[PDB]
């Protein structure tokens, strides 16, 4: 099951805050600690180059309030991006499928083993920390598609932000 972009895709206008709100995958452990999980913040913004777009998560982890920097590349197609290091055998390509970048964006990841296909991963984000089912839905339909089973999608609790 390969993996298309949202069409026109436009960077600045995804710039800014979201809060992911569900998540699904075809990762054994993540499906375990899928419940666990509750509302994270994204922030997106310009990268040191022109040829990055840098990315700021905020998270609870257990006690611990996570922030978590990285930097991933832009790539020849407009909404697909790639994180890789090699020497730590990390390999992730990620595609912002759908958005209206006003309200919500459905995120797909790929994350690359050498020990076995890639793990799908696929994240909705709001504008908003509030859901609206109508939109968890949509995002349903979408990661399915991309072979993510029924079970295996969950809604994040609203636990509010946290500074670290
Ligand atoms: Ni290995």
Known sequence: ?????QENFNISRIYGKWYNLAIGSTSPWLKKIMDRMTVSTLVLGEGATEAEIS???????????????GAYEKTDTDGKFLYHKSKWNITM???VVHTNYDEYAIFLTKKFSRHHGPTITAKLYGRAPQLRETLLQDFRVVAQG???PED????????????P
């Open 93 to 95: 390509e990620s595609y």
């Open 55 to 69: 990315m700021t998560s905020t998270r609870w982890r257990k006690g611990v309030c996570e922030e978590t920097s």
């Open 1 to 5: 099951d390969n993996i298309q972009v």
């Open 146 to 148: 991309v072979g993510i």
């Open 152 to 163: 295996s999608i969950f809604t994040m609790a609203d636990r509010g932000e946290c500074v």
